[PDB]
């Protein structure tokens, strides 16, 4: 039984976000203050398991079982930057819900409990 209250968290830090990703059941997410660039917010999804190449750049194999990406907010509409896709959604209800059927950039549709 979790909330959105404790799914979002703008002090939480990345490392904080992975950690509970990786301690949480599979295709919980959790959105946190994104200090990348204004206007942005830091979408974080746990998976069920690695790829099937496993080629972690600079990073532990445990990062892959997290997936954190930075979503931009313009005035094309709200995509996450990281692909060359760019959807370009309504809000981040938008690309969350809608995550929940097309995933694109995680690996795995996005799981919302309890909303």
Do not use: N
Request: hydrophobic share 35%; with cysteine; aromatic share 8%.
């Amino acid at each position: 039984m979790d909330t959105s209250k404790f799914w979002y968290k703008p002090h939480l830090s990345r490392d904080q976000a992975i950690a509970l990703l990786k301690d949480k059941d599979p295709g919980a997410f959790l959105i946190r203050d994104s200090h990348s660039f204004q206007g942005a917010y830091g979408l974080a999804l746990k998976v069920a398991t690695p790829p099937p190449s496993a080629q972690p750049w600079k990073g532990d194999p445990v990062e892959q079982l997290v997936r954190h990406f930075l979503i931009e907010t313009g005035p094309k509409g709200v995509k996450i930057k990281g692909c060359p896709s760019e959807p370009y959604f309504g809000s981040l209800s938008a690309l969350v819900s809608q995550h929940s059927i097309s995933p694109i950039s995680l690996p795995c549709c996005l799981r919302i409990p309890s909303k």
